[PDB]
Each structure stands twice: as structure tokens, then as C-alpha cells.
Design a protein around this nucleic acid. Structure first.
Lengths: 194, 200, 199, 198
DNA sequence: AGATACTCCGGAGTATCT
DNA sequence: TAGATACTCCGGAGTATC
């Protein structure tokens, strides 16, 4: 419904100053309206975070998951979906951060175990990759190294584009994709051909 | 210059890292060092001043290790790899001092701040860009005398320092890590970053 | 509509005048208009934001009352005395407001402020300086073309405005004032600032 | 010793003018003197005592240089002008002290000694504005001063003479003679007004 | 002598609530 | 939804100390 626009504003606000330095009537002003709407839809302020995680976490699936079925190597295919991952990062940025804003933060029972579910839907999103580099090393397209660290260091590095990439808000599909491609070419290819 | 100031900075750095700058109180930091709130305010006048003190120590403590390798013997990548391990070596050592120097930029325009604090905060937000610069400046000459691939400098340096610091989202603590046993792993992940993945 | 906010400003402006910014608490301002801390905080993000709201309004009124007197006829002197009476008139009727535009310059560097607050305050302070250089322009017109003695127009401006505002010291407000009584007193005050004493 | 206190009050008064009484902390004053709070409290039982100590000093400081001019020869205007300019240069060299004389009386906890001390200290200020109130009354009586309300002309005169701290900041390295030279220009406008006769 | 801390407590700011 | 209730926690004056 009309819930979509508060999250589009709450996501960036939650990314802007963090969850704490974000007050709730701060987001009441970024979508100029009643702050009762906020509670009539969301039973508490943490509901907003779970919702932005909710409509975010699965949002990433829809872009990158289709690239698992596409044929080819581990490299030929991991770069295919990791591009889509950081492609998605450059488009819905605010959501992308709220899928990791649990790092610096009592609760309710239903609200808490809500978060437990999405946390493993992130696990299984990450573990989708953890397979493909396990195959990637075995296949021979990927530099023979520890298969369980490289998963940790990919989604460490894939999500890390939020650190330096600010926004363009109008960058076409071409230029998000073509910077999504030379960012993973930097990570998958490393630097130094000899 | 830190006798008991050092152990205030040390204890608050962990707290800011495990429960955020928001949710750590001064009498939290007080308990962590065995005294009460009055001692901490005897050595710092605001709470944000504890933060800036960790921010300044955390960066003096990384340019002391890495900057020696700027003029290290060898190739641009050989210096670069030298640099980027020392960066991770102290990240893994002082993960507490690190989580505050890289996660403290939103304050810029959105928090009540005396000017002395505010312009001292952005004084380090440009101190870091010099640390970023001395990397960038060797990803350049890593290519001028051809030690690395011809990809554009800026993004390569921008992506890398982002990569170098992204080790805190998963790095555990191996209680009793020797000075080379972080080196056995720091050097592991820089070469996964410089070498990337995939043969010829 | 937004006339509850005016009550908060009216209450805050007075409470700031007497008690001062530090000793005025939100619950106090909440008491002056008979509500809780909440209603004060429903119309303002911070306490320094009600301070800027009094400043902004205060400068808005005094510029409205005084400005139509410089583009007016008469000499540079007769215009100067016309604005100067109007300025002290604003003093005598709304001095809870004038006292915050006339005090609060220290916040510049030693008080904690969001940069919207520090910048928004710096804006009004140059709204001040542009108001005050209306006076500078006219003393020069008065001095040069006949009206006023050939004195240092910079010091004359610095003095005059400081004398114009020094009325905050000895002035309090008779219960149920009348603006007819205050216009005569304001012109009495102005008579000695431009006329001085002596011969 | 006795010098050490004087630079507490010096630094205190200066801070009180720039931050105001409320916004200067005890550790603030400790810094401008380069010391610790346990010194200032060894030296002063409360922070308000700091305020009255400089109130009490800055008032005998201003009176010690202006009484010689109320008995000084000259008509009303002459000595009144001479009184005022002496009062002004006082504020131009001590305006940390000069400001503090009008920044006070039952608001916050005011241990009975110092409320009794304070509104007594206010009395010597009223008696101070009386020497003027007299000589302006003595000035309108002879003819050196024009025929105006002696009560109002007193209030508006020293109100004005104290309003110098609005624009005069400090120079800290100004000669006595360039201070006295500027103080007269100020009072030449306060007394002479602005506007000729022809 | 007077430097180090303790301790008491106001008072701004917040989430949430009927 | 407005304005309200209850509450966290920073900072400051003041005192107690080995």
C-alpha cells in the first residue's frame, strides 16, 4: 500500500545516521504526514526496521537468485550474480544498509524472533554464494584458497560498496551495471596479472 | 601520553563496538575501568571528546605501522601488499579502535556539537583522506612502472580501502593471537584482495 | 492553526528575558502556557529551536516597524529620529522578543549546536547587521548633507544603536500599557540620544 | 598568595562576559588560569562567591577614578563629562569586571550571606548612579545642561555609558592615551548629541 | 596546598501510549 | 493524532579525599 514510501525514506534515514540517531518524528517529517500513520501500520519503531529489512532482504533475492541457474563456470557465474548483488546495492541503497544495522543494536517476543527468521534468510542468501565458491575452487576457475573465508570476504566486500558509493539518483541501468562490473572485476580479478 | 586516559579510551572503544556509541553510558565505561563517572569526566569534558580521543589514537596507531612501508623496497604492489597487511594487522589487534574511526561520519551535520569538537572531527575526516591518499598514490605507481593492472586508480583505491576495512563484519578474536599469527591471516586476505580469484 | 506556537514563543520570549536561556526549562515554558513538555516539543525539534524562533520573529517585527521610515521624507536626521523612536517603541511593547535578538551572540562557538542551528543563527545575525546598517546609511546622509555634525559615522552608529537598546536596562512595563504613552516616552528617550545635553 | 587570586578573578570575570555567568563552569575558569577546581574551591566557597568577589572589586575599581571628578572644578557639564569619560575608559580596560556589575537576585539558591551580600552590593551601585543623578540635576540648574528630566537623563546616561561593552571588545595592548582619546569621542556624542543650530 | 575523583541531581531529549 | 506520561542519561556545582 502507501507503506512503501515510509520505508523508502526510513531506509536511508536509518542508513544516514544509524538506527539510534534516527528519531521517529524525523521520519515523520521526511514523509510529511501524521506520525500516527507510522504506528497504525507499524506497532512500534522497531517494526519499521524489521519492515525495511523485510521488504529489503527478499528484494535482493529477486535480482541475484536468477543468476544461479545460468550455466557456466563458478567464476563465469559468481561474477554474474555478485554484479547483480552490487547492482542492487547501488539502486536500493538504504535497504541494503538496514540488512546490516544490527551490528551496534530488550525487545518483544514476536518482534525478536521475527528478526531471527530474516537473519537466516540472509544466511541462506550468503550461503547461496558459499556453495558457488566451493564449486568455484573445485572447478578450477578460482584461485585455490580457503573456501570458507572467501565467502566471508566476498559479502564483506560486496556489501562494502556502501562505504564509498554515495548516490547518483538518475544513473541509468547501463552505468550502474558498468560500475557494478568493474567493481567485481577489481575483486574477482584482483590486481596484477603477473 | 596516556597513563589512565589510555585505559578509558581502551574500554570505551570496545563498548562503542559491541553496543554502539548511543547505548554506552559513562557509568558503563566507569564500571569497565573500575571507577565511577566522576573520574572519566576528570579526563574528558564531553562524551564526544572520549569518541574523538579514540578516533585520533586509532589513526595514529595505523599510520605508525603502514606508513613505513610506503618507501619499502620493491614493486608498487610489493609496497602495496606491505602496506595493506599492516593495515589489517592492527585492525585485527585493535578491532575496537577500528570500529570507531571508520563508522563515525554521519555526525558531520546532524548532532549538537561545539565547534571545537565539530571542526576537530572533520580535521580527522581529512586526516584519513591522506591515509587513503598514500594508498592511492601507490596504486598509481603500481601501474606507472607496471606492477598492477591498468584499471583506473581512484576506484581501485576506493574499492580497496573499503575492502581492507570490511574485515570487522566477520573477523573473530583468537584470544592469544601472536604477532605473526595475525600476520599469517592478514597476509592471507590482502593477497586474496591483490590476487583476487581465478587463474589463467 | 499556528497560533499555539505564538503562545509558546510569547511565553518563551518572556521567560528567556527574565530567567535567561539556561534557567528557563521546557517544563517551565510548558507551565507558562499551561501544558506539558510535550506540546512544546510537538512544535519544535529542540530547545534551541524555540530560541531561534523568538529571534527570527523578533527581528521580523522590528524591521517591519522601522523600515518604512527611511524611505520616508524629511532629512537624514528627521528620518533617523523617526526610525529611532520606532526602534525603541518595539523595545517598549515587545521586550521579551527584543532581549533575545539583543543577547545570544556567545552561542557562536561554545554551545553545542546542529549545523542547521549554527547556520540558521548566523543567518539572523546578518539579518541584524543589515537592519543596523540601515542606520549607518542614514547617519551618513544626515552627517554629509547638513543634518548631523561631522562626526565619525562608524562610532556614531555603534553608539546610537547601543544607546537605542540600552533602554532594556531601566524599562519595565506598567500593567496595561498604552502605545500612546509609549510613543511619548520613546521620543523622550530619542530626544536625548540625538539631542544629547548642553547647548 | 594574593596575586594568584587576582588572576582567578581576572580570568573568571572575562569568561563571565563572553559566556555569561551560567555558561562558565568552574573547570572553565580553572583552565584560563591553567589550574584545577580544587584550587578555586580552596580559594572560593562557591561559584557565586567568585561572582561577587569580582562584583565587589570592579565597583571600588570604578569608583576610585571617578569621585576625584565630582569634586573637580568645573560646571555641571565639565565635571559630568569628566566623570563619564573616566567611567568609560574603566570599562575599556576592565570590561570583564565592568560587565559583571549588571548581570545579577533571588533566582537560584543564594546562601543567605550572599543574598545579603549581593543586594548590599547593589546599593553602592545605586549610590554610584546618584553622583551622576546629582550632577545632572546640578547641571540643569546652572545652564551647562539643557532642560530635561533629571531622573530620565540620569537613567539614559549611564545606561548608555555601560552600553559601550556591546561593541567595544578588547585590545590588550592599547595605550592609556589611545583609550582616553577614544572614551572622549564616545562621551562627545552622549553629551553633545548629534545636530547643530544655524 | 590543592590536585583527583566522587556523588547528587537537574533537566534536555525520546519512545510510546490509552 | 494530537498532546501526554514516564524515563534515560549527560553534564555541572560541590564535596571528600590519601
Amino acid at each position: 500500500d502507501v507503506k512503501g514510501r515510509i520505508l523508502d525514506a526510513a531506509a536511508d534515514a536509518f542508513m544516514l545516521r544509524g538506527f539510534a540517531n534516527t528519531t521517529i518524528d524525523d521520519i515523520a517529517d521526511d514523509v510529511g504526514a501524521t506520525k500516527g500513520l507510522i504506528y497504525y501500520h507499524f506497532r512500534s519503531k522497531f517494526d519499521i526496521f524489521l519492515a525495511v529489512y523485510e521488504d529489503g532482504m527478499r528484494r535482493v533475492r529477486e535480482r541475484v537468485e536468477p543468476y544461479v541457474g545460468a550455466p557456466g563456470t563458478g567464476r563465469q557465474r559468481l561474477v554474474a550474480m555478485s554484479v547483480a548483488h552490487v547492482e542492487n546495492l547501488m539502486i536500493d541503497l538504504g535497504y541494503h544498509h538496514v540488512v546490516h544495522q544490527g551490528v551496534r543494536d530488550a525487545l518483544k517476543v514476536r518482534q525478536r524472533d521475527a528478526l531471527a527468521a530474516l537473519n537466516e534468510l540472509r544466511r541462506d542468501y550468503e550461503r547461496m554464494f558459499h556453495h558457488v565458491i566451493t564449486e568455484g575452487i573445485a572447478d578450477g576457475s578460482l584461485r585455490n584458497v580457503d573456501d570458507a573465508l572467501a565467502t566471508r570476504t566476498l559479502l564483506s566486500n560486496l556489501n562494502a560498496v556502501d562505504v564509498w558509493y554515495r548516490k547518483i539518483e538518475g544513473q541509468t541501468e547501463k552505468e550502474v551495471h558498468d560500475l557494478a562490473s568493474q567493481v567485481v572485476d577489481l575483486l574477482i580479478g584482483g590486481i596484477g596479472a603477473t
